[PDB]
Structures are given as C-alpha cells and as structure tokens.
Design a protein around this nucleic acid. Structure first.
Ligand SMILES: [Mg+2]
Ligand SMILES: [Mg+2]
Ligand SMILES: [Mg+2]
Length: 1034
RNA sequence: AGAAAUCCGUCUUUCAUUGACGGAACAGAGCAAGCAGGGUGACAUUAUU
DNA sequence: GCCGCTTTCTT
DNA sequence: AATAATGTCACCCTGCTTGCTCTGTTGAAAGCGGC
DNA sequence: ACCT
C-alpha cells in the first residue's frame, strides 16, 4: 500500500481590528460550546452499560475488562469546571457495585484507591447521567437506548473501538436524507450467502462480481444507485464491483468485510431522544452548524476518551505493581531492614527510604560471602566491596547501612534484604502514584479548506518584492449569529519557500522546496541589493532567493497536487498548517540490494553510523539470515562555515588554549583579586586565594568551552562567602564573563559540553542570589525575592535557560537531518537505533543524571523516528545491551562473541590511573563485561610480555606506598617499542578502539595483537555496526 | 483580500542587508530527575602533637 | 468546474 | 591516641528548572443544487 | 547494557 507522512507549518495570524474581533468571538463561541460538550459527554459516558461495552469490544482478540471500562467511564477525577456530583473516594467501590450489580474487581479497587492532585475531585458520572436524563425530560432507558445506537454507529468512542471522526453531528442532528439501510442489509446478507457455498472458488473476481450483480439486480453502471442510493462515499462492495475482473479474488477478505457490514447495519437508527438532545445542544451552544458543533465535539470527546483509556491501562498496571509489592513483602525482613534507623549506626535527624542501590544491589550477595568466609574483619570486607564497586555512573552504597546489615546477616539473608529494599521503593512509588483527571484542555480549532490554494492566491508581486502573504478564507460568526467568510493574512517564509511560492520550473517537480527533499535555492549575488529593516533581513534573504529562482525559471512546481489545506487556530492567534504527502509504497522484507544502517549515540564523541548492504554472495549472517556486506562507517556531523573555515556545530569544542590568551588573562586579573571562603571546621572562616584554583584549571591547557565551564565553577566558589559590597563588585565580573568576548551569550557550539557550560553559568547566578539573600533551610528564597533584589541578573537566569533550550532543539533537529541525509545519499531504507537508552533514576549519580538530561538520547531517537518515514525509511528500535562489545559479523554468527574496548595511550602518558584501571581490570573477573576486560588485561600482558608484572600489578590499590610506579611500566613498554612516543593499547571501559575480527569500520587497519590478526577499528563505528546487525525487538 | 513580514531557530574571540545553515506541529495528564544555598552523616589522604 | 452543503465510509 | 586541613560519598529541605511517555488531534470520498 |  501507499504510505504517507505529515509536515506542518506554524505562524501567527495578522487580521485587522474588525476581523480580529470576529475571530476572537468565533473562537470564544467554539470554546464555550467545547466546554458544554465536555460536561454533556462526561454525563453521557457516565450512562454506558456493561452490555454496550461488551458489544463494542466483542471481536477484540484479548478480552477486555468490561467492569473496568465501565468504571473508568462512570467515575472520573475531574476539575472544578466539570464537577457535577462529588463523590467521596470512600464510597466509590460501594457506588460502583450499586451500578454494576456485583463485587468491584481488584483493578477497579486500584483505580479508586489511587491518589489525585489537590485541584481534582472524584465525580460520579452515572449520577450525572441520571440528572441529565431529568434535564432532558426523558426516561433513562430511552436515553440509554439512544446511547446504544450511538456506540453501535461508532459516533462515540467506547473502550477499544474508536469513534468515526465527527460523524455524531451529521448522524444525530443532520438535516439531510439518510441511507436506505434495509436494502444494504438484504443485499449484503445474500451476497455472503451466495459466496459461502461455492463449489469452485474462482481465482479472479469476475465470477464473484457476476454473483453480486445478479443478487443486487444491478449492472456495473447501476450498482451504486441500487445498493447505496448514490449516497455517501463508495463502499467496499461498490469498489469490488469497480475492479478489473481479472484481479485476484480474496474470498476470506470479502466475507470479513460483508460480515462487518451485516454487524454494523443490523439495527436501524431509531432514536428516542433525538429532538430533545438537539434542542438541548442548540440552546446551550449556537444555532445548528455541522462544522462548529463538530469542532466543539471533537475537542471535548478527545479530551474525555484519552483519559478513560489511560486510566484503564493505569489501573491494570497498578494492580500488577500491587501484587508484586505484596509478594515480596517479608514482614520481618522489611521491618528489621528499616529498623536500621532505630539503631545506633544512624544519628540523623530524619529517615529515608532504603533502596536496592543503597545496599550495592546484587553484590550484597558477594558481601555476605565475604562475611561468611572471613568474619571478625567485616569492615574490611565492606571497604573492599565498595572500592571494587565504585562506578562513574552508579550511586555508591551507604557504608553504615551495610554495617548495620552485618549485625542481622545471620537472621536475614542477602536476597531477603534486597527483596525488602525493592519492596520499600515499590511501595513508595505505589503510594504517590496518581490517577488521571479528565480536563477539557486548550487544543485549537480546525477550519477545513481554509488556505487559499497557491495557484489561486491573490499575489501583489513587485519587481523586487514578491507578495509574501498567505491568506486564509475562514467562516466567522457575527454578533447576529450569521456565518460569513473573511480573508485573513499570515506570513511564513518557510511555507512560502517550500510550497506556497509560485514555481515556474520547466522540468523539475519536487514535494518540498528544501534541501532534504532535493531542492536548493539559488545563491545571492552582488546584484541582489537587499534594503530592508534590520529585523527582517533573514526573511528578506529567503524572499530574494526565491525571487532569483523565479527569474531564472528554476523554481520547481510542487507535485503534491493539493486540493485543500486546513488551518488550526487557537485563542492566541497562532495558526498551524498540516500538509500530508505520499512517501512511496510500503516496503517488503529485505531483498538483495536493500541497504540498512545502524547508529550509536555518544555523549562526548560524535554519534556514529554504519552502512551495510544485503548481497547475493558474501559473508553470511545468521540472525539476518542473509548475506551482508559492509559499505561504510562515519561520524554524524552538521557542518557550517565561517569564511571558508568549517565547524561541526555538534562537536566543536571552542578555541585551543594558545588562541584565547587575552580572554584568559582577563579572568586571571579577576581571580588574583579574590579568595574562596570556607567555614566547615567550626564557625571559623578559612581563606584560599582563587589563583590556586585558576592555575590548576589552566594547567592542562583546556580548550575554550571546557575552560569556560571550569571558570564558571570557580566564580561560583568565589561568590560563596561574600558580603553585599563584594557581590556588587563580583556582579560586575559576572556580567563581563557572561556577556563579552567568549561568554556563552556569544560563543558556544551545540556540544553536550557547551550545554553543561551554560548550566554552570546559571549556577554562578543561582549562588549569587542564594548568598545575597542569606538562604538557608529555615530561610528559603523565592523568585519574587530574587527578582526584587537584582532584576537584570534574574533575567539572565531565564535567558541562559532559553539559550540551552534553543540549542537542544536545534541540535536534535540537526542530528536527525545529518543521519537522514546520509541515508538518502547512500540509498538506505532501514535504520536501527538503540531504543533502550537510560534517562535518569535514583540509582545513578546526580552528575551523570544531569549529563543524561542534557544528552537527549530518547529525543534524538524520536526525531529520527519522525523524519525517517518522510522518505519511506523504516526505523527499528533495538536493545542497547552489549552493542559496544560484540564482534561484528561474529557475534551470534553462530555464537556469542564479545571483546573489551581499548585506548591508544603514548607510553609517556601512562600514569597511575592506567595502573589503577589495569589492576582493577585484572583482579576484576566477574559476570557481565568485566570478563572481557579481565581477558583484555591478560592479552595486554601477553602481547607486551609484561606477565611478570601481573602478580604485583594485582596488589595495586590506590595510595599504597609499595605500589609499582608508572616509570616501571613506561620503561618496560619503551624498552619494547623503542621510544617514548609510540602508542600502547590499553583495555579501558569506554575506549574508542575495538579489535575487530573483520574490517567493519571505514579506515580500519589490521595488526597482530597477542598472536591474533585483528582490525583496529573505531569503537563507536563497531557499535553502530552491531546495532545495524541486530534484528531482535526491544 | 489589507505591503507588509524575521514561521521557528543554530554556528563563529569572524556576527554577516550577497556569511554558512537546520526543523511536522499541538493539547492535556502523568512520570522521572536536576540545581543553588543550607542542614545532617559516613569515609579517605595529608600533616602533625 | 467551483462552492458549500449533505451523506456514508468497516481504511 | 586527636586535631585539623582537604577531598570524597550519601540522605533531607524550599523553590525553581528540565526530559520523557501516554493518548490523542490536524478526515475520506462520493452527489446535490446554485452559480 | 547503553553513557566515560
Ligand atoms: Mg551505544
Ligand atoms: Mg550568537
Ligand atoms: Mg558508543
């Protein structure tokens, strides 16, 4: 079938005063009718029955909890604006049972027992339904009968059966002739009859078309008139009659569609309360208008259905969580675990929830073993495990909690202790968990056929200024209630460029006139002569280029064949323009010649991509079950130029050290004048001269943006113990750093490091405000106070955060663009990406969590997911586990194959940290990836013939005076490699080098290491290859 | 149908009226975390009496 | 053919 | 032993800040009468 | 496990 995607444009409307008033009144009208339908539909959904739900969910393959669907429609947490019949949560269960005829299910119990925010209140929508029946002056059974018709006609969304657009307005309040349903039902039933018992199932549809025409007593030219009275969109049966006749016949499918029609049309639409309901709606809104009532209904109905569905799923989830909690609730082990706070191993003012990560997690087991194996030295076992654990990502255990656990290890096993910690976390999260309130929301309203078509646009073009206006033609409601259409303009140079400007190209047709869709605008020259206001130049430039393209006759004509464009408008005048377009036919599974890629997301280094082809002959891959060939690997990059020099906006690290001496000098003059205040001995004040820290920062010659982050921290430290006078002087320095020369307000790339730098600068200003206003636990400060004290610098807080927000949005867009453009250029139809990456969690260090917040792994994946189907490129998510260590084309071909990662360190640069890592890795044989790094250390010693060192290398702990020095390893390696500048391969986690069996990374070179031929590859390119080769779902 | 308008943004000790460039959007609810001060509380290294 | 309205469509 | 420097780790608070998921929307396709 |  033909796949499609959606692009869109967003601007603000510019109506004159009179039309602005009309638009304001029309939107207010639509909004008030929306609130009315919201309350009325809340009432009507309060009125559904178990048997309506049963009928709507009946063909569902998984059985639905009908009682729970009833519940999520009968009782809703709601806002004060729709609260009509307050119910205490106490009574929820009881009242539900009264309505349901039986005991409330456990999932329903979880839904009722869940928390709600303070501005929300439980509302009994079934009582609201009864009172609505009274207001309408109809019997309850009558309105319920009409509700059954509505839910059968798909006019309302019930459970898993979605609504049929806005059809409710036409079906219930429409003024026109309707279908002859009995005719369609008879014809459909006999057609299913006739095709039920065929003694020869034809391969083509011609005999079946014969049968249908004979039953319907019509010809191919009269079937529509006979069957549907020439009314409505063509049915499946009409289009079956329309088919060629040599086309193949799917008997199963025709029977399925005919059964659908018999099921949906067996009961007629005989309303009981139609005219009451129409009078009610019209009195509470405006005189009947299909479009306007449709918009009101759409807003209200969407708002209600999304929350009912979410609460259904949430209640099921909550029941599962509750059963998991009550399962591992070992009363005694939990109680003694928490008795840690009531024991003298804790002297804190307050307690806190004990979690798995506070215990070391699984490794608590190991610790118990130590205690079994060497009692009466428990402190050393604790210290050894803690040192072995320490990870730059995971949060370290609480030493006293482990100390107290030793006390009770005879009574409480390791597994029961970790079960108890898991129970603590799960119960806490279960208790704060909140049900979802039904609220109208602030969605806008859509006018259909609102944009004047580009080829019909009124254009007041000048020789040097194209008419840049796009006009909507909208029906608006006047004070007398009359609807009239008015022209309202808006500007969008991107919508102008991509679609709306009048193309004149003799030979070119494209979908969107922008580079990623294959079109580039002409270059501006010395003849361009742009003379506009300063605040329009960029827009002017785009206009100029389009003008040039029209003058050259090279502006492509849009091939989208747009016949109507709709516009969605809100109360603030903003307009949204959706454009749907076809992207090609749906792809089949991998053929030979199909190309696919994978991408690896990195933080400090570039995202990597790896490009592969399915081949007829070549290297076989089991998991793909095909032959594959490596095309190429690379770094994801987004270059822009400054007078010929290139910059990767994604990775640029700013000026090298020697190139910003002046800037550094200025910072230097400041720090020589100041000192850091510190008072954590007693209340006595300790002074250190800031230059000490500044020299330390400048010692290892960082590049510009790292330097700026480090200097931001320094400034914050300088600001900490000062007085107001001092702060006034310091305020002058803070402004110079932020605003001039190399400050984040003029320089900084889209790199993660730059975002962290801007965050550190915000930290400076935050510390300024905290110290100035004497902040404390008993004296919290607010934004009101901060703004009153120093409005300008408080404004800089928001400005810096907006800078970060804009950087991050632009960055996500640019990463997706670079990868998609790589795919288009290398004819890639499939992308694999890690859909698995961590966001943030209590078990992770706050520094790593903050970095991950600025990393935006999920956002990047979502953006690639958004852009890929716009070029018929499929994106698959895959689990990220072990993708950095698998050996490409060897792992799962046929067996599991993994290796450590390596770094290329010059021998002179081999410091005590290398020994730390080497020692740790060697004495680190364990489950998971440690085994591969222990193996890598083994191979390292073998290759460099340093095995004699292994022994003492294993006794290496940090700070031991009898540790082997760096000069030892450096001198052996320089003995063997000849000099001090030759590289040494070291196994280190996160290293950028992978020793691959195969040449699976562009630019790899083969060496022999530990008597093994192996390709020295970029580790992230290896990871991208691993991701590309994965087939398993996430 | 009313000549005005950066649609929204990015890079650069380069800030550009011919510099180089990028983007489907929107609503509500929910969840997860971060920071600046301030408190608590454990450990570890130095360097001494 | 267009506009503005109706209806049904099982995608 | 014991004091005090400097660093690590964690746990809490007030009042702000952020990213991510969920469940949805931005209709399709035909005829009619009046232009 | 990703992430260094
Ligand atoms: Mg990865
Ligand atoms: Mg700038
Ligand atoms: Mg990687």
């Amino acid at each position: 079938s033909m796949s499609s995607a959606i692009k869109s444009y967003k601007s603000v409307l510019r109506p004159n005063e009179r039309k602005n008033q009309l638009l304001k009144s029309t939107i207010q009208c639509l909004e008030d009718g929306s609130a009315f339908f919201f309350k009325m539909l809340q009432g009507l959904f309060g009125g559904i029955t178990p048997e309506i739900v049963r009928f709507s969910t009946e063909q569902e393959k998984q059985q639905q909890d009908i009682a729970l669907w009833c519940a999520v429609n009968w009782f809703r947490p709601v806002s004060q604006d729709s609260l009509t019949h307050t119910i205490a949560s106490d009574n929820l269960v009881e009242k539900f049972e009264e309505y349901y005829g039986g005991t409330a299910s456990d999932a329903i119990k979880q839904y009722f027992s869940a928390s709600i925010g303070e501005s929300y209140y439980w509302n009994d929508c079934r009582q609201q339904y009864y009172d609505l029946c009274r207001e309408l002056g109809v019997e309850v059974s009558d309105l319920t009968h009409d509700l059954e018709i509505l839910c059968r006609e798909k006019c309302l969304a019930v459970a898993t059966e979605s609504n049929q657009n806005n059809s409710i307005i036409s079906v219930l309040f429409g003024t026109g002739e309707k279908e002859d349903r009995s005719v369609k039902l008879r014809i459909t039933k006999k057609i299913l009859e006739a095709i039920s018992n065929l003694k020869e199932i034809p391969k083509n549809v011609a005999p079946i078309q014969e049968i249908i025409l004979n039953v319907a007593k019509a010809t191919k030219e009269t079937f529509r008139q006979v069957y549907a009275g020439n009314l409505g969109a063509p049915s499946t049966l009409e289009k079956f009659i329309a088919k060629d006749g040599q086309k193949e016949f799917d008997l199963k499918k025709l029977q399925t569609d005919l059964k659908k029609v018999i099921r949906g049309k067996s009961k007629e639409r005989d309303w009981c309360c139609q005219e009451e309901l129409r009078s009610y709606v019209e009195q509470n809104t405006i005189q009947y208008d299909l479009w306007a009532w449709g918009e009101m209904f759409n807003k209200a109905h969407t708002a209600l259905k999304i929350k009912s569905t979410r609460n259904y799923n949430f209640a099921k989830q909550r029941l599962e969580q509750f059963k998991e909690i009550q399962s591992l609730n070992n009363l005694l082990v939990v109680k003694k675990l928490n008795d840690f706070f009531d024991s003298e191993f804790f002297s804190g003012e307050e307690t806190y929830t004990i979690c798995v990560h506070h215990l070391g997690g699984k490794d608590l087991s190991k610790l118990y073993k130590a205690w079994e194996d060497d009692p009466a030295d428990p402190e050393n076992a604790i210290v050894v495990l803690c040192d072995d654990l320490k990870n730059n990502f995971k949060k370290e255990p609480i030493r006293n909690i482990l100390r107290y656990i030793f006390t009770i290890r005879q009574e409480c096993s390791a597994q029961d202790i970790l079960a108890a910690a898991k129970y603590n976390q799960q119960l806490d999260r279960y208790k704060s968990q909140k049900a979802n309130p039904s609220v109208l929301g602030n969605q806008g309203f859509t006018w259909t056929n609102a944009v004047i078509l580009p080829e019909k646009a009124q254009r007041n073009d000048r020789p040097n200024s194209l008419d840049l206006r796009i006009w909507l033609y909208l029906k608006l409601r006047h004070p007398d209630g009359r609807w009239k259409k008015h022209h309202i303009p808006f500007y969008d140079t991107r919508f102008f460029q991509e679609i709306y400007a009048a193309g004149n190209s003799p030979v070119d047709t494209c979908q969107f006139r922008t580079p990623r869709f294959g079109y580039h605008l002409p270059k501006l020259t010395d003849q361009t002569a742009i003379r506009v206001n300063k605040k329009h130049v960029k827009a002017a430039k785009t206009e100029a280029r389009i003008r040039l393209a029209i003058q050259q006759g090279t502006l492509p004509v849009s091939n989208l064949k747009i016949t109507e464009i709709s516009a969605t408008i809100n109360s603030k005048g903003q307009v949204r323009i959706p454009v749907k377009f076809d992207v090609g036919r749906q792809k089949g599974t991998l053929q030979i010649g199909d190309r696919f890629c994978g991408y690896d997301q990195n933080q400090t280094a570039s995202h990597a991509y790896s490009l592969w082809e399915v081949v007829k002959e070549g290297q076989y891959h089991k998991e793909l079950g095909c032959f594959v060939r490596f095309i190429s690997s690379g770094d994801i990059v987004s270059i822009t130029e400054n007078r010929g020099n290139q910059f990767d906006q994604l990775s640029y690290e700013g000026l090298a050290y020697p190139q910003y001496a002046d800037w550094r000098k200025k910072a230097s003059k400041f720090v020589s004048l100041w000192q850091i205040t510190k008072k954590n001995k007693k209340k006595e004040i300790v002074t250190v001269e800031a230059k000490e820290k500044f020299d330390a920062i400048c010692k290892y010659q960082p590049r510009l943006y790292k330097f700026n982050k480090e200097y931001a921290y320094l400034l914050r430290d300088i600001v900490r113990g000062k007085s107001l006078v001092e702060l006034q002087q310091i305020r002058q320095e803070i402004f110079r750093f932020i605003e001039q020369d190399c400050g984040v307000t003029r320089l900084g790339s889209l790199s993660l490091s730059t975002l962290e730098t801007v965050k550190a600068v915000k930290g400076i200003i935050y510390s300024y405000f905290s110290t100035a206003l004497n902040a404390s636990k008993n004296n919290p400060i607010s934004d009101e106070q901060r703004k009153e004290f120093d409005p300008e610098l408080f404004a800089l807080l928001e400005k810096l955060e907006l800078i970060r927000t804009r950087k991050k949005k632009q960055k996500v867009e640019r990463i997706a663009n670079s990868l998609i453009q790589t795919c288009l250029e290398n004819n890639i139809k499939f992308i694999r990406g890690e859909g698995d990456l961590s966001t943030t969690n209590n078990a992770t260090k706050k520094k790593a969590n903050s970095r991950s917040m600025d990393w935006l792994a999920r956002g990047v994946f979502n953006k690639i997911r958004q852009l890929a189907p716009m070029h018929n490129i499929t994106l698959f998510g895959c689990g990220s586990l072990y993708t950095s260590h698998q050996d490409p084309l060897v792992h799962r071909n046929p067996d599991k194959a993994m290796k450590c990662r390596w770094a290329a360190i010059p021998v002179k640069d081999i410091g005590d940290w290398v020994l730390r890592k080497l020692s740790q890795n060697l004495r680190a044989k364990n489950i998971g990836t440690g085994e591969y790094y222990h193996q890598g250390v083994k191979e390292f010693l073998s290759h460099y013939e340093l095995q004699d060192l292994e022994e003492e290398l294993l006794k290496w702990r940090s700070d031991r005076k009898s540790n082997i020095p760096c000069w030892v390893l450096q001198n052996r390696l320089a003995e063997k490699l000849g000099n001090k500048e030759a590289v040494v391969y070291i196994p280190v986690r996160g290293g950028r080098i992978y020793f691959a069996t195969h040449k699976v990374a562009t630019g790899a070179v083969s060496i022999v290491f530990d008597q093994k031929q192996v390709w020295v590859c970029n580790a992230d390119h290896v990871a991208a290859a691993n991701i590309a080769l994965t087939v398993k779902g996430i």
